[PDB]
Amino acid sequence: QSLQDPFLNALRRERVPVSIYLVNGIKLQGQIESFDQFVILLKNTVSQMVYKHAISTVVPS
Amino acid sequence: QSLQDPFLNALRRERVPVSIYLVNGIKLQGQIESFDQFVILLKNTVSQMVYKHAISTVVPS
Amino acid sequence: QSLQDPFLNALRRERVPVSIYLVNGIKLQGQIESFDQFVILLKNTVSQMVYKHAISTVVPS
Amino acid sequence: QSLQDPFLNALRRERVPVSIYLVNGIKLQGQIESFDQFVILLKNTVSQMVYKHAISTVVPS
Amino acid sequence: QSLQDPFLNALRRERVPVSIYLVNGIKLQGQIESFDQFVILLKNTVSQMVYKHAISTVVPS
Amino acid sequence: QSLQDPFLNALRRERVPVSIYLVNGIKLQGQIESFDQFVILLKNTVSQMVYKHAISTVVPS
Ligand SMILES: Nc1ncnc2c1ncn2[C@@H]1O[C@H](COP(=O)(O)OP(=O)(O)OP(=O)(O)O)[C@@H](O)[C@H]1O
Ligand SMILES: Nc1ncnc2c1ncn2[C@@H]1O[C@H](COP(=O)(O)OP(=O)(O)OP(=O)(O)O)[C@@H](O)[C@H]1O
Ligand SMILES: Nc1ncnc2c1ncn2[C@@H]1O[C@H](COP(=O)(O)OP(=O)(O)OP(=O)(O)O)[C@@H](O)[C@H]1O
Ligand SMILES: Nc1ncnc2c1ncn2[C@@H]1O[C@H](COP(=O)(O)OP(=O)(O)OP(=O)(O)O)[C@@H](O)[C@H]1O
């Protein structure tokens, strides 16, 4: 049904450290501040906006 | 749609070890835990969310 | 319009061996088993689900 | 749409030998047999189906 | 829309020499003849059709 | 509705220096002059139009 939002929501609520791999193979690490339909906000030392279209995978680190 | 979900649900139901090849050539392995319109869930040691847009092919390993 | 379905049907209906080139230069080969809006099913040694967004060209082998 | 369809139609109608550069760096050559919303059919020797999403540029050779 | 069409239209009416960078690092050069919703026509010697999906940046050169 | 728009707007309004990482690992730097649904205009020397589909991350620099 819907899997993406619960997975990301749960990762956020529980403040879980995640690795975000980009489609070019670059790995980003932080925690999920928020997300909407197109982007995921990732906090570490500064918050950065990652476009979903550039993401391959999100996995707990 | 009408071909994807059954293919994916069969693998999920039957606990088939699968290879997911990404568009960047990276090959991920595991079993399909779940999926929605946009993402596929692959389990072994951690559950990782893979965006379909980053996927090239899904195959039994 | 729709050019894609007939082209692929003809290959499926008539068991033409086909070479499928992916956006990362990799080339798959087999027989078009079926397809829907988003995926093609290559059947060769195995049934594999190829996302069309990962495909660059489809050529008769 | 209003610039793309005319551009492609002229090439097909006038039997112009074309070069289709793909995003992956491959260059396909041939004549445009036909096109629709999603693909271009490019001939010669055989007909090859090209997904527009894989194309960067289309130019007469 | 409120940003893209005015930017491109100004470059077109004013015949500004432009660099169009593709997502693969290819840099095209020319002037904008025309655009629609999906493509940009870039001309110097020969008008070439560039798909927007393959474009990263458009810059006055 | 948006997380994306507020994030980009705050950076724009406060002239916050940003790094825009493209999907091909190329890094752009500047200030966000403006944006719409599909593009971002990034300031000096000469403003350049960047397609969002080509962007991986926007980071305050
Ligand atoms: N789950 C994954 N999804 C997408 N890409 C991955 C994944 N795991 C690894 N990669 C990519 O494969 C390449 C090599 O993987 P590598 O094992 O170095 O990952 P790592 O996170 O750097 O280290 P490790 O996996 O040992 O923790 C890297 O470029 C990385 O981006
Ligand atoms: N169906 C596919 N879709 C996308 N990429 C693929 C596919 N099959 C292989 N590749 C990639 O193309 C390259 C060549 O494949 P090759 O068969 O040599 O890999 P391998 O190391 O033998 O093991 P594997 O094929 O299972 O990755 C590999 O880097 C692989 O990740
Ligand atoms: N504004 C831009 N948008 C997208 N790609 C660009 C841009 N500028 C340069 N590139 C690409 O980055 C690559 C770097 O090569 P080049 O030396 O020509 O540019 P560059 O000035 O090094 O770019 P940078 O220093 O920002 O990495 C080139 O392949 C080029 O096509
Ligand atoms: N936040 C980010 N988003 C996307 N790509 C990044 C990011 N940070 C780094 N990269 C990419 O990873 C490469 C090297 O990774 P690293 O994290 O070491 O960045 P860096 O080279 O130290 O600094 P910079 O990213 O400014 O080049 C860079 O070439 C860059 O393109």
Residue numbers in the entry:
A (entry chain C), B (entry chain D), C (entry chain E), D (entry chain F), E (entry chain A), F (entry chain B): 5 to 65
Please share excerpts from the published article on this structure.
Crystallographic studies of the conserved core of Hfq of different Bacteria revealed a hexameric ring-shaped structure, similar to Sm and Sm-like proteins involved in RNA transactions in Eukaryotes. Biochemical, genetic and structural studies suggested two distinct RNA binding sites on Hfq. The proximal site appears to preferably bind sRNAs, whereas the distal site binds A-rich motifs.
The crystals were obtained from a C-terminally truncated Hfq variant, comprising aa 1–65 of E. coli Hfq (Hfq65) in complex with ATP. In the present structure, electron density corresponding to the ATP molecules was observed in four out of six R-sites. The adenine moiety is stabilized in the binding pocket by aromatic stacking interaction with Tyr-25 and by favourable hydrophobic interactions with the side chains of Leu-26, Ile-30, and Leu-32 of the adjacent subunit. The adenine nitrogen atom N3 is hydrogen-bonded to a buried water molecule, which in turn hydrogen bonds to the main-chain carbonyl oxygen of Leu-26, and to the side-chains of Ser-60 and Asn-28. In our crystal structure three out of four ATP ligands bind according to the second cluster binding mode, and one according to the first. Common to all the binding sites is the coordination of the adenosine ribose 2′-OH by the carbonyl-group of Gly-29. The electron density for the three-phosphates, which was weaker compared to the rest of the ligand, revealed different conformations of the phosphates, which bind with their first phosphate group either directly or via solvent-mediated interactions to the hydroxyl group of Tyr-25 and the NZ atom of Lys-31, while the second and the third phosphate groups are solvent exposed. In the Hfq-ATP complex, Gly-29 interacts specifically with the adenosine ribose 2′-OH and not with the phosphate groups, which in turn bind to Tyr-25 and Lys-31, making it rather unlikely that Hfq is endowed with ATPase activity.
